[PDB]
Every structure is written in structure tokens, then in C-alpha cells.
Design a protein around this nucleic acid. Structure first.
Lengths: 69, 68, 39, 80, 264, 50, 215, 220, 444
RNA sequence: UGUAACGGUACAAGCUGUAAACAAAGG
RNA sequence: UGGUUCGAAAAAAAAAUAAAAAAAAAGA
RNA sequence: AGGUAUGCAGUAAAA
RNA sequence: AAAGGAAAGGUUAACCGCUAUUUAAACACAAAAAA
């Protein structure tokens, strides 16, 4: 190389502003692909069916659709 | 690092003849600790050197055994 | 004056012995809702 | 990856970011930034803890073990 | 990326002391000023009201003082004029400045009218002479004037370098054991007599050893500093009011020319 | 020679002898007037604070 | 994350617990684990109203447990984890002292970990050189005048309980003998101030000759 | 009269005692001497020096500054010698008796002059500084003259254990000395140094402004 | 872009000098806090216009206007005399809250209109049973600040605070006790009762920030009982860290007063507390700039013409001395102005008497000059020199400072006007004497 | 809806929301 | 001592953050 | 030659 | 000569803006309407 060697930089500002959560949202990519640390639309099954021996008074299924005061 | 994400294990795949011991720096640190303990009346070095089950009060030892 | 209450009588208290610590540690039942409803 | 939440790093914090990053933890606001880098505090916004007079209170954290027997008998005498 | 500033400035300045000394030279001696001498006078108009009014009311004076030639202007204060000029002279000066301003305002808006032109000409010439008696060719800064008067010369600065006092009379609790050269500046533009300049030790110089480490060998004005610079019998109160085309020095007495002075 | 001189001076310090030094000609090992330049800087800082 | 504190509480849920530190803490100081979202005013009011403690100062730090990799045991899963929880460490300075046996850790297994003994003579981190700002007495405003011991009022108050002469506090095993002022000697030995006593004779000021070739 | 209240007299006596203790400590070396230790001891100050200060105030000999070492060299007053508390301390404390006997023996009677002060100073036997011949000597100064470099290289193992030699036997230092002397020409008993006494007793000192608001920098 | 090398160098040097200027500028800002507190829970939620016609104002409106003007520093003589006229018209219809806010405004602005306080005090006394903590505190505070002394009403206010002890705010009670001590209005029984209540208030209800306000040397010397003194001196050692220079100064003065006048209490203290105060005596407690007044300067000028060396406005121990002679250091003078006494009277203030007694017992020979007598001399210098000489030829003043003859508000106003005229004349003929007036121009 | 961050819980691929596994016996 | 905050100057947005929770009758 | 300590608007001049 | 900073803030001036405004902190002090 010439003089002092320069390679790919580790820059938190650049990485977070170019490849972060919101930047990935603004990108044009396949959003049906699962991303561990970012936005994706591989949807889950939700809370599973109650087993016959559990207490229905404690079994829970909904959070937002029933949110009262 | 402690999480073992670095590549520092790459060099350890090759032999080396020896390694620096940093004894000057480590002895300065150890003597600083010893002084901190000694200003309060504690002989940390004596405690560290005591044999298992050995009791030595004050600044005593084999020489005390010899002359007593 | 009052901050001592965070450790007084507990196993962190340095001014009391092991038997006193155990005696202080013994505890009864939690308040039942039936009795709580009467207050 | 070498930057971001990967490898157990989790969400970003001011400790792990360069100076200039602004992220708190959920504290309430207690004043206003001025136009010259100051912060005027208003004590009217300090939450007021409501604590009753605990002196001379016969209640305690737990209940004596005999209370169960006493209440059970007192209720069985009514039920029967 | 960083937002550190102030004492955490991310700029990697040089630590070389010689380079920093050169930087001092560039930052103080070779600094560039945009404003002009009349800009400075206007900035201090409230304290130099009479001279500001004269500069703005006497034809030609502003043109003379706005020229590129590096100049030094010694500005008296209204307080100086009031203290040193006789009441009649001050009244005459105020009346004539007001007269010129009134004629200017008339412009904005027999023999008796003819005499007005003669009076205007006379007043303009006299006030122009007075004002230009303080304008001096060249740029003479305060440190240059001091070094010309000899302060800073080890052979001549005696009586200005080792001032001391009877310490026990002023800081007794610390002294229990004691409890028991005229330079000449070019003449004003309106005259031919060169201006004398000298230096003296201020009353505050003697008290330095009481509160500073010293290495000595074996009424009075209240102006600050250790050295006082006198110009033509007038004390400099505020110096180095630098401009683009000169420098203004504030003085405590007006330098009236001999022609305008009254012999008897 | 530096080691020997340092040993001797430290020995005097430990003994508690008066803080005397060799007085002879000290050679000049540097070129810069750092002392006076820094003093001028400090003067300017003090004036700014005032 | 934690619920924001309402203007009126009536039922505080915040847990203030004593934290045993491996570092040193002063006499009138104590370290507490506290929820991260609480302010110093909230902490002080909480302690003064629920316990009646007379709090003088609150200092706060945010503690995030370090990342850890599971690498050791048989069949290890190389996954990342944190031990404990993120919390606010509140160091409270009160009007009265707090027992060292309460506030700090001790050990007879690792004999070096005795902060109550070692005090501030050690740094309990990777810090090598300790930084301490100047003390209040060393400051100028509200600081100790170095000639006040000679004044009448301090001597009237001293009585027979105190002796104000600083010459009496000189450590014999550290100070050196007085030198002759007319002969070469160090300034640091016995002066301990930033000025030159007049009793030291006139000193020579040497200015570097930067251009010998010119002369 | 001369006093407005008991607290007035107490303040003046405390100031006088502090001044006397300072003077005696400086007379005996200000530290490193058993005499200084004894003068520092709380009992000696409480009894002996307190009585001495009261006697001085009674005698109206309140001197301040360097002119007060007369008091330090004067013998202890007979009132101090005859005070019963002083006698009890003398009996109970060997150091107090030793110190008081030394003060009685080594004193200037007239102060109750310079020749007598010199005699008493010699008797005191306060240790004196002494500039060492080692620090008067010289050792080679880098850069070395080629002959010096060459000789030291050849005799490394012998000449570099103690390179100190008397002035003039080191060419490197001699040349620099001669050059400095030439530039100078072109241009044209050992006693420990002490800071002068800053304490006092007189009204002029006691009732002087404290000057703590004024910004005095030379604190001492 | 690029710069020509000269321009590069000049601007680079400017940048370096700016950095160094910033560093030098921030050097002395040890007590500059970026986080700052502002008190606003006393501001009323109603809106008012201060210049509205007074005849349309009621108690609720005029009180709010007065307080708002005091907060905004709108110190206009015409506005505040209109306030006084309207308030005196509405005296019959003011609640304790409104009267408290009015007194706050007047005291905070230091508007020394004695007639308004005199006319409002009887209604305060009549309505005392309905007063609350803030109103009582404010009335006492304003009276103390403006030097309007009414011992009977102040004692009644203190008694009302005692009766409402369970409702009083701790800070208000502390301020009331301090004001009572400074005005000298509590006989021994009331002093004992106030001390007994203050002990419990401080021990149970006050943290360090509230307690530090109780440290007042006048109250310690003249009001507090011995157990209260001991408790206060012991507690200050614990609460020092949160204190400011004013608190340190008052603690030091309290310790000196106890040592000089109550040696038994000083000894009843413990060795650790005594050590704390001994070490406090060694500190540089930041004072604030003091300068001779016009009357002080006139007295100094007359003394210098008489021929007595002296120094002015200096600090000895924990006291400020007006004049301290040089030849005989024990001789000192105090120049007493209108604010050193209570309004319309020649009775000295408690602080002045305490300072006089302490300095006298510590040894100073004090002499005092009264402005009421000085003003009658006029601009004459021979008369003033003779006055000072005759005072010098007489013995010093006793350790107990006695009050002067009786006076009235009429005479006080007349003397204040005369002092104004004398000040004007002296300044005029000083500056005229300074002016040379010797340059004569032949311009005409 | 779905998912996740922190927090609590056997410091967890489970459960769970500062009431963080349980109220079922109230004018 | 810095960030924050005003300016440069920016939705040119650092997911789990704020002077940032429905925004004055606030009960002094 | 960024902003310094009652704070929001707001015009001019400038080491 | 290759022709180089002015936004916000501080200073001075001007000012019929405003609690979007300096403690219900304190020290000092011959000091002030109308009549």
C-alpha cells in the first residue's frame, strides 16, 4: 500500500444512519425475510390455544384490540 | 476481549519462545497495595506466605523460632 | 436516623448475632384478601 | 455485524455512542432548556409522595399463624 | 462524528511553543480591523460627544479623517474638555458647533445674510484647525510609544521597574518584623510643533511586591496599569482603539494649538 | 552516569540532608523559550479572566 | 421502560436496596440500587418521607451489566447474556455515618479485597493514576488561609485544645534540613507555595542565545 | 486598667503564647530536635508557655517580629519557675524538667548583648547545614571531549563507578566554565536560611486588619 | 477553497487566540451551574395590569399588582405612592392573604414608606386569628427589612405563630423567630416558648436546607436558650456541606458571640464541635464589596484634616470596622446612618448593639458618630473638626450601647432632606475644586 | 393483528408486566 | 469539563428516547 | 471568528 | 493578490413589547413622590 494503510471504517454514526432500523425501513428490499435486529413482516402465530386443563380466567389472547382506559 | 469476538486467538496458533512478565509494573502495583494495607497495621505479604495452619503474630518466623 | 431501617435486624445488620438474625427472619402468612377487605 | 445490536450489544445507549447522542431512561421532566445552554428547574413538577403517619401502627407485614384457625372456626360456626 | 467542543475541542492544535509564539505575533500585531477611526469615535460618541459633533459638523474634517493614510488620533473626552477648558471657551465651542449643525439643518430644510457666510467660514476654519490638531501622521500604537519613551530598556527603565512602598503602613499584619526620556512625534496635521511623549510610574506600581514574587537586586491619577503614558501634557486613558487606517488613543486633556490659545 | 547521580541524590533525600545541588555549569539541552512563551500565555489567560 | 412517576403517587412501587460495593465509600455515604428512571429529587424525597433520613447529597450512575459469552461448560452454547439487571446506583451522602461492614464488602479468601481498609489509597479499577480535584480547603474561596493561624480570633478559640502553628505538623521522616539560602538548593524542600521568598538572594535570568553564528 | 475584660486578656495572652512558642521553636530549629518536640508537646504549651506568656504580658514586653527573639533567649521568669503547676509537670515529666533546665542554663541574663546571644547559640548546639565536597566536585558532561569519551570507553569498568573529581580535572566542565567566564567578561559562615518571624503580640499586630478580603497572595 | 498564505496564517492565529481566550474566560467559574432553579409557586393565576386606575382596584387586584411590580422591579415612585393611597383607602377590606402579598411587595422592593405600614398594622393585629403562615412570615419579614419596628405587633405575630404551630410552615416559623430576634420584641417568656417550639421544628420537620436558615447570630446571642444553642451549633457541623458563604459567616459570628459572652455554653459544647469552629475561623469566607458611604467619607475627611491617621472599611475577625486608627490601633469609629436605627427613632438595632458589645469586650475603644447630629453641622469643616476633636478628648463608649433621644417621623424626614442637600453641595464643590479651568482660547 | 426492548420469575428457546402466577369467603 | 439546548441546519429522523403523557383554574 | 450564569421577543454598530 | 467570518449570543446604543422575568434568599446603606 501507499503510506499509511486505510481500510473499511467502523463508524457508528454512518452505520446507524445508513443501515439502522429506520434506514432499513426506507430501503427497497424483501421485507418478508426474517431479520433478527430489524423490521420484518414474517408474522407469528400469536398466543397458542389453551390446553384443556388450564384456567380460562387466566388464559390471555388479546392486547391492543381490547385496550380500555 | 472477554466475549471472545476478537481475532486474538489467531496468533496463539503459532509457537513463541516466551513472553514479557511486566514485573516492574506489577511489583509497583503490588507494593502500592502493600503500603495501603501496612499503613493500617496489616502484613499482607506475611499472610500470603503463611503455611496452611501456620500462625505467626507480629513480624516473626523461622528466625524467631531459632532464637527463642 | 431512619435510613438504618434498610438493614436493621436483617442478615446485613453487623450489630446482632446469628440467632437473633434467624429469629428476626422467621415470618408468618401473607395478608389474605378476605381480611384485607375488612380494612 | 460489527456495529449495531448484533452479538449481544442490544439497543444503542449514550455510553456506547459518541458524544452528542441523546437518550435517557424514562425520567420525568422538571424544567426547560434556555437559549444559552442552561436549564431552568421548576420544583412544582417534582412528584409528591403521599406517606401516612406510620407511627403507632399496630399492623405488620405478615399475620400470626393462629389467625387462620381463629377465622376458620369463626366462619364454620356461621356456616354450620 | 462528534459533538465535543469547548474544552473538549477535537481540533488537533500544535503544541510547539515557537509556533505558538509566531501565532501570537500574527494574532496581535498583524490582526486586521474592518472598522475605521470615525467608526471607533462614533462607538465612543457618548463619552466623546463634543468631538463627534465637531467631526460630523465641520466640513472636510470627516474626509481628512477617513483617508487611507495610517493615522493616529488623540481623542479628548467631554469630561476632559469640561475640566480643562475655561467656561467661556467651552461655551464658545458648544455655540459654534451648534451653529454649524443649525446651518446644516437649514440646508436640509442683505448684509445680515452676507455676514453668515463669513461667520461660517471663520468657524469652519477654527474648528477644523482644532480637530486636526489631534491628527498625527503614521500609526503609533501604545507599546511602540512606551518602548520609544524607554520603558522596557534595561538601561533607562530605572525608577519605573523597582517601585516599592512602606509596606507595613498598608499590609501591617504581614510585616510584624517591620511594625517595630521625552520622545517626539511628528507635528499635528494643522501645526508644525512636534508632540512630546513621556512615561511615568503609576501609584499602583509600588504595591506589586506586596502580592507578587519579586526578584529585586540589592494629585495622582487613578488610571489603571503600572505605567502612565503622557502625550503633550495629557494622560492616555484608553489606548489601542485600533482601526483599518489608524489608531485612536483616548486622552484626558485637549491639545489646543498655540494659535488658538490666548496669549494674555 | 545519570543513574549514579540519581542514586546519590535520592540517598541524600532519604537521609534528610539539606536540599543542596551541584551549582556548576548546567548545559542547555533545548532550543525553545518554553518557560517565557508559556508565561505570556498565562498572562493572557489571567487578563481574559479579569 | 419503568412506568413514569405520577404527580401524586399514593402507592410507590420503587424498591431502594442497599448495594455492597467492592470500592471505597466515605463515612457519611451509602450506595443503593434504584430504578433507572428516578431523579435525584425523587430519590431524596423518597428517602426523607418514607424513612425520615436527613439526606445532604445524591449522586447517580447508570450500571449496565457487561456482555457475557457462554463458552466454558460442556456442550456450551456460545450465546450472549447479561448477569443481573440495569439499574441506577445512587450514592447518598447523609448527615450521619453508615457502618462500613454494611456499606462495603469484605473477604478473608481474597485478602486484597478489603476496601474499608485500603480506602482511597487504591483505585479499584483499571485506572492507574488517581485523579482528585483540589479540596475545599485548598481552594481560595472558603479555603484555609495559610496565615490565619497567626490571627487573634483563631487563637482565642483554640484555647488548649488545638495548636495552630503549622511548624508543629512537620513530618520529621519526610522533610529535609534547612539549607543555606546563599548556596544552590531546591525550592520544593520547604517552601510549598508558588512564589519566591525575599530572603533568597537575587537570581540570574538567562535568555537563550538562539543565533550564536550572528555574533 | 489596660484591659476591658477577662476575654480581652485571654485573647492577648493566647496571642502572646503563640508568638513565644514560634520564637522558641525557631530558636531551637523548628523541627528535628527534642527541644522542638517538647515545645510542641501539649502539656508544655498548656502550662509552661502559658505561664511564660502571662508573665510577658504582665511585664509589658509585647514585641513582634524578628525583634522578639530577645524573649526567646531571655531566661524563664521566676514566676514561671515558682508556679506550682510547673513544678508538678517538672516532677511528673522527665522531658519537661530537662527542657526547663536547659532553658534556665542557656539564656541571656541581660534580656530579663550580641556576644551573649552568640554564646547561647553555640551552647544550644542546633545542627547546622554543611555543603558536601561531593556536590562541589564535577563529573564528565555530555557531549564528552574526544579524549574523555575514548578513555572512558577503554576503562568502562573502572572509571564509571564514581566519576566525581575535583574542579579542573574534568575537561568538559572546565571548557564550559571558561567559556562562561569569557562571556561574563564580555558582558562587563554557613547558616541555615530562615523566613523572618511573622507573629506578634503588640496591639499594632493584634488589632491590624486581617486583609482576607483584599486578595493578598504572599500568604505567610 | 483555499486561502492566500498570509490570510491562512492570520486566520489560524485568530482561531488559536479565540481558543485561548475561551479557556482563560472559563477559569474562575467554579460556582457557575448550568442547572438553575427558579421559584414560581407564589405567582397568582389571575392576570392584572399594574398601571390600571387605582380607583377600580380592590384588595385582591391591588395586592396582585403590588407583588407583580415587586417581582418585575417596576420601582416607579408615582405608581407606588398611588398604590399606597389606594391601599390605605381599602385598609378595611383586605384579607390576610392580600395583606401578606402587599407586605411582600413593599418589603421586597424596599419601598420605605413608613405611613403605609403604620396604617396597615392595626388591621393586621385585629385579623391575626385568621392569618396563615405565609402572611405572618411576610409581615414580619417586610417589617424587619424596612426597619419599621412595632414590638407589640411583632410579639403578637409570634404568639399567633405559636398558637398555630401545628399549621405553620417550618421556614415561615424560622423566619418569624429571626425577625423577632432582630427587632428585639420577645420578652424572656416568649423567647423561651419560641426556642422550645423551634427545637422540635428543627429536629422533626427541617432538613439541612431548611435548618441552615435558622443559623443567625443575633438570635443565638439574644433569643435562643442554651439547649437550642447547643443543638444549633452541633447541627451546623453536620449541615455545613450544603451551606453558602452567608451561612458560614453567620455561624462564625454565632460561635464568636457564644465564646465572648457565654463561655459556659462554649465549654458545654464538645471538643469535636469546638474543633470544627476553630477550623472554620481559619477559612477565607467570601465577603461582599463594601465602600464608605457619603457620610463615612465626610467623617474620614474631617478626621484626616484633624490629623489622625486611619484606615476605612476593613475586616477584622468576623467584623467590619468603619474606621480603624493606625497610631493607636485599638481606637475605632463607627458612622451611624438612618438605617442603623429603627424608623423615626434613635434606638439602635440588635445587630449593631451585639457588634458593639462584642468588639468592646474584645478590646476595641469604640467611638460613634450620629447622622442626626452630623447633619446639623452643614458644610462647615472647622465645626466638624472641632466635633471630632471633642469626641476624641472624651472616654470611649461602654460595652453596652445605649439608645439616643426620642425623635419623630417628621424630624427624620427633615433630616433626610437636609442630608440630601448636603450631599449635593459637597459633591458639587469637590468636583469643582478638582477642575482646573485654566485653558483660555482666543477663538472669538 | 404480529413482533420486539427492558423489567419480574429457577439471572430462561417457558411464563409474564412494577398488581410482573394469581381474586373466586364484601354494603 | 462536555453533550443536551439557541445558531450553523438538516423528516440529512441513530426503534424501545425526550424541556415531548389531552394542551391552565393551577385551589396560590 | 459560534453562543456564559432573571428569560422570551426585537432594530442598528463594531478588536 | 489568488481578494478571504457576521446566524445565535454578549457589549454599546435605541426601545410606548412581555411575569415565556432575578429566591416568600441575603448583605449594605445620610434616602425617594405629592404637599
Amino acid at each position: 500500500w501507499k503510506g499509511n494503510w486505510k481500510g473499511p471504517q467502523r463508524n457508528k454514526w454512518k452505520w446507524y444512519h445508513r443501515h439502522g432500523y429506520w434506514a432499513t425501513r426506507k430501503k427497497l428490499i424483501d421485507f418478508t425475510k426474517y431479520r433478527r435486529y430489524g423490521y420484518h413482516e414474517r408474522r407469528g402465530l400469536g398466543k397458542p390455544r389453551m390446553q384443556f386443563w388450564e384456567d380460562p380466567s387466566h388464559h390471555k389472547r388479546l392486547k391492543k384490540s381490547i385496550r380500555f382506559w | 476481549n472477554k466475549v471472545r469476538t476478537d481475532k486474538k486467538e489467531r496468533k496463539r496458533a503459532f509457537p513463541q519462545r516466551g513472553f514479557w512478565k511486566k514485573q516492574n509494573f506489577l511489583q509497583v502495583k503490588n507494593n502500592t497495595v502493600r503500603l495501603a494495607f501496612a499503613v493500617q497495621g496489616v502484613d499482607l505479604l506475611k499472610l500470603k506466605r503463611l503455611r496452611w495452619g501456620e500462625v505467626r503474630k507480629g513480624n516473626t518466623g523461622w528466625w524467631t523460632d531459632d532464637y527463642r | 436516623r431512619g435510613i438504618d431501617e434498610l438493614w436493621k435486624g436483617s442478615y446485613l445488620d453487623p450489630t446482632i448475632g446469628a440467632k437473633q438474625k434467624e429469629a428476626n427472619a422467621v415470618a408468618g402468612d401473607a395478608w389474605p384478601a378476605c381480611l384485607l377487605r375488612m380494612k | 455485524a460489527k456495529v449495531g445490536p448484533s452479538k449481544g450489544r442490544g439497543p444503542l445507549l449514550a455510553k456506547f455512542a459518541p458524544v452528542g447522542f441523546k437518550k435517557g431512561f424514562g425520567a420525568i421532566g422538571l424544567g426547560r432548556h434556555t437559549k444559552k445552554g442552561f436549564f431552568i428547574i421548576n420544583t412544582m413538577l417534582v412528584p409528591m409522595f403521599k406517606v401516612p403517619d406510620l407511627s403507632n401502627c399496630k399492623l405488620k407485614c405478615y399475620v400470626a399463624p393462629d389467625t387462620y384457625r381463629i377465622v376458620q372456626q369463626s366462619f364454620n360456626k356461621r356456616e354450620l | 462524528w462528534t459533538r465535543a467542543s469547548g474544552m473538549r475541542n477535537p481540533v488537533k492544535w500544535t503544541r510547539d511553543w515557537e509556533v505558538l509564539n509566531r501565532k501570537v505575533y500574527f494574532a496581535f500585531d498583524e490582526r486586521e480591523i474592518r472598522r475605521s477611526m470615525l467608526d471607533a469615535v462614533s462607538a465612543h460618541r457618548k463619552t466623546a460627544s463634543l468631538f463627534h459633533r465637531m467631526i460630523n459638523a465641520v466640513p472636510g474634517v470627516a474626509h481628512a479623517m477617513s483617508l487611507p493614510g495610517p493615522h493616529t488620533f488623540f481623542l479628548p473626552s467631554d469630561k476632559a474638555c469640561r475640566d480643562h477648558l475655561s467656561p467661556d471657551s467651552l461655551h464658545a465651542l458648544t455655540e459654534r458647533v451648534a451653529f454649524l449643525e443649525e446651518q446644516q439643518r437649514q440646508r436640509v430644510g442683505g448684509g445680515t445674510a452676507a455676514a453668515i457666510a463669513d461667520r461660517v467660514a471663520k468657524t469652519t476654519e477654527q474648528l477644523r484647525t482644532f480637530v486636526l490638531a489631534h491628527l498625527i501622521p503614521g500609526e503609533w500604537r501604545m507599546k511602540t510609544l512606551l518602548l520609544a519613551c524607554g520603558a522596557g530598556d534595561p538601561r533607562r527603565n530605572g525608577s519605573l521597574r523597582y517601585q516599592d512602598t512602606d509596606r507595613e503602613l498598608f499590609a501591617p499584619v504581614m510585616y510584624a518584623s517591620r511594625l517595630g526620556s521625552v520622545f517626539l512625534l511628528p507635528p499635528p496635521q494643522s501645526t508644525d510643533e512636534p508632540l512630546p511623549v513621556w512615561v511615568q510610574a503609576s501609584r499602583y506600581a509600588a504595591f506589586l511586591p506586596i502580592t507578587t514574587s519579586t526578584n529585586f537586586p540589592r494629585r495622582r491619577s487613578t488610571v489603571g496599569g503600572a505605567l502612565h503614558l503622557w502625550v503633550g501634557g495629557a494622560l492616555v486613558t484608553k489606548g489601542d482603539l485600533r482601526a483599518h487606517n489608524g489608531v485612536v488613543h483616548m486622552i484626558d486633556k485637549p491639545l489646543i494649538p498655540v494659535q488658538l490659545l490666548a496669549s494674555p | 552516569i545519570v543513574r549514579i547521580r540519581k542514586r546519590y541524590m535520592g540517598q541524600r533525600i532519604e537521609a534528610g540532608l539539606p536540599p543542596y545541588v551541584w551549582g556548576g555549569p548546567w548545559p542547555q539541552w533545548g532550543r525553545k523559550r518554553s518557560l517565557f512563551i508559556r508565561g505570556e500565555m498565562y498572562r493572557r489567560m489571567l487578563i481574559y479572566s479579569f | 421502560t419503568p412506568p413514569k412517576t405520577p404527580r401524586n403517587v399514593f402507592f410507590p412501587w420503587q424498591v431502594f436496596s442497599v448495594h455492597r460495593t467492592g470500592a471505597f465509600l466515605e463515612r457519611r455515604r451509602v450506595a443503593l440500587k434504584v430504578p433507572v428512571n428516578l431523579t435525584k429529587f425523587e430519590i431524596q424525597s423518597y428517602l426523607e418521607k418514607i424513612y425520615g433520613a436527613r439526606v445532604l447529597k445524591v449522586s447517580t450512575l447508570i450500571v449496565v451489566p457487561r456482555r457475557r459469552r457462554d463458552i466454558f461448560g460442556p456442550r456450551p452454547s456460545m450465546r450472549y447474556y447479561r448477569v443481573g439487571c440495569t439499574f441506577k446506583k445512587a450514592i447518598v451522602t447523609l448527615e450521619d455515618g453508615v457502618p462500613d461492614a454494611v456499606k462495603m464488602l469484605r473477604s478473608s479468601i481474597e485478602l486484597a479485597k478489603n476496601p474499608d481498609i485500603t480506602k482511597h489509597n487504591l483505585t479499584y479499577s483499571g485506572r492507574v493514576r488517581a485523579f482528585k480535584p483540589p479540596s475545599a480547603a485548598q481552594r481560595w474561596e472558603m479555603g484555609e488561609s495559610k496565615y490565619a493561624w497567626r490571627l487573634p480570633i483563631p487563637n482565642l478559640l483554640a484555647g488548649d485544645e488545638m495548636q495552630l502553628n503549622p511548624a508543629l505538623r512537620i513530618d520529621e521522616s519526610t522533610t529535609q534540613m534547612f539549607p543555606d539560602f546563599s548556596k544552590p538548593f531546591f525550592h520544593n524542600a520547604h517552601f510549598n507555595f508558588s512564589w519566591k521568598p525575599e530572603e533568597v538572594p537575587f537570581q540570574q535570568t538567562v535568555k537563550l542565545d538562539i543565533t550564536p553564528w550572528r555574533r | 486598667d489596660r484591659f476591658r475584660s477577662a476575654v480581652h486578656r485571654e485573647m492577648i495572652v493566647a496571642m502572646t503564647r503563640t508568638h513565644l512558642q514560634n520564637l522558641l521553636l525557631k530558636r531551637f530549629g523548628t523541627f528535628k530536635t527534642q527541644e522542638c518536640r517538647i515545645l510542641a508537646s501539649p502539656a508544655f504549651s498548656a502550662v509552661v508557655l502559658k505561664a511564660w506568656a502571662s508573665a510577658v504580658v504582665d511585664a509589658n514586653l509585647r514585641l513582634d517580629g524578628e525583634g522578639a527573639m530577645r524573649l526567646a533567649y531571655a531566661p524563664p521568669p521566676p514566676a514561671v519557675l515558682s508556679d506550682p503547676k510547673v513544678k508538678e509537670l517538672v516532677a511528673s515529666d522527665p522531658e519537661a524538667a530537662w527542657m526547663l533546665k536547659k532553658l534556665s542554663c542557656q539564656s541571656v541574663a541581660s534580656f530579663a548583648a550580641l556576644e551573649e546571644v552568640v554564646r547561647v547559640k553555640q551552647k544550644d548546639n542546633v545542627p547546622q547545614p554543611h555543603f558536601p565536597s561531593v556536590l562541589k566536585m564535577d563529573h564528565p558532561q555530555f557531549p564528552y571531549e574526544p579524549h574523555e569519551l575514548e578513555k572512558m570507553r577503554d576503562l568502562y569498568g573502572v572509571l564509571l563507578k564514581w566519576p566525581y573529581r575535583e574542579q579542573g580535572q574534568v575537561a568538559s566542565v572546565a571548557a564550559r566554565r571558561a567559556s562562561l567566564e569569557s562571556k561574563r567578561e564580555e558582558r562587563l559562615t554557613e547558616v541555615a536560611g530562615q523566613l523572618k518571624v511573622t507573629t506578634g503580640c503588640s496591639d499594632s499586630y493584634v488589632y491590624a486588619p486581617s486583609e482576607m478580603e483584599t486578595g493578598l497572595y504572599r500568604e505567610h | 477553497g483555499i486561502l492566500r498564505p498570509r490570510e491562512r496564517l492570520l486566520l489560524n492565529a485568530l482561531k488559536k487566540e479565540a481558543d485561548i481566550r475561551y479557556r482563560g474566560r472559563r477559569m474562575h467559574k467554579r460556582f457557575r451551574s448550568w442547572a438553575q432553579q427558579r421559584v414560581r409557586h407564589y405567582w397568582l393565576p389571575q392576570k392584572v395590569c399594574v398601571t390600571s386606575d387605582p380607583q377600580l382596584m380592590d384588595g385582591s387586584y391591588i395586592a396582585a399588582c403590588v407583588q407583580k411590580a415587586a417581582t418585575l422591579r417596576k420601582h416607579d415612585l408615582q405608581l407606588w405612592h398611588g398604590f399606597s393611597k389606594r391601599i390605605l383607602e381599602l385598609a378595611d377590606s383586605l384579607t390576610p392573604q392580600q395583606m401578606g402579598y402587599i407586605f411582600y411587595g413593599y418589603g421586597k422592593s424596599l419601598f420605605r414608606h413608613e405611613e403605609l405600614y403604620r396604617g396597615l398594622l392595626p388591621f393586621v393585629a385585629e385579623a391575626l386569628p385568621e392569618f396563615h403562615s405565609h402572611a405572618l412570615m411576610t409581615v414580619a419579614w417586610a417589617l424587619e427589612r424596612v426597619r419599621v419596628n412595632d414590638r407589640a405587633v411583632v410579639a403578637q405575630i409570634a404568639e399567633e405563630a405559636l398558637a398555630k404551630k401545628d399549621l405553620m410552615r417550618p421556614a415561615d416559623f424560622i423566619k418569624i423567630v429571626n425577625c423577632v430576634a432582630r427587632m428585639g420584641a420577645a420578652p424572656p417568656s416568649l423567647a423561651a416558648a419560641l426556642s422550645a417550639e423551634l427545637m422540635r421544628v428543627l429536629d422533626e420537620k427541617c432538613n439541612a436546607l431548611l435548618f441552615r436558615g435558622a443559623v443567625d447570630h443575633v438570635a443565638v446571642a439574644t433569643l435562643y436558650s442554651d439547649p437550642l444553642r447547643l443543638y444549633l451549633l452541633e447541627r451546623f457541623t453536620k449541615t455545613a456541606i450544603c451551606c453558602r458563604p452567608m451561612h458560614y459567616q453567620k455561624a462564625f459570628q454565632s460561635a464568636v458571640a457564644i465564646r465572648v459572652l457565654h463561655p459556659p455554653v462554649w465549654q458545654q459544647l464538645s471538643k469535636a464541635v469546638r474543633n470544627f469552629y476553630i477550623r472554620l475561623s481559619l477559612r477565607r469566607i467570601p465577603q461582599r464589596a463594601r465602600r464608605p458611604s457619603p457620610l463615612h467619607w465626610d467623617v474620614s475627611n474631617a478626621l484626616a484634616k484633624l490629623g489622625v491617621f486611619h484606615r476605612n472599611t476593613f475586616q477584622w475577625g468576623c467584623f467590619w470596622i468603619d474606621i480603624g486608627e493606625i497610631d493607636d490601633r485599638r481606637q475605632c469609629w463607627f458612622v451611624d446612618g438612618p438605617s442603623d436605627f429603627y424608623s423615626s427613632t434613635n434606638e439602635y438595632t440588635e445587630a449593631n448593639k451585639l457588634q458593639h458589645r462584642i468588639l468592646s469586650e474584645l478590646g476595641w475603644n469604640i467611638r460613634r458618630v450620629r447622622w442626626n447630629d452630623w447633619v446639623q453641622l452643614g458644610t462647615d469643616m472647622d465645626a466638624k473638626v472641632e466635633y471630632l476633636r471633642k469626641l476624641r478628648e472624651r472616654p470611649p463608649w461602654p460595652a453596652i450601647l445605649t439608645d439616643g433621644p426620642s425623635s419623630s417621623r417628621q424630624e427624620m424626614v427633615a433630616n433626610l432632606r437636609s442630608a440630601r442637600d448636603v450631599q449635593r453641595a459637597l459633591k458639587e464643590r469637590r468636583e469643582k475644586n478638582r477642575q482646573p479651568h485654566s485653558l483660555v482660547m482666543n477663538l472669538g
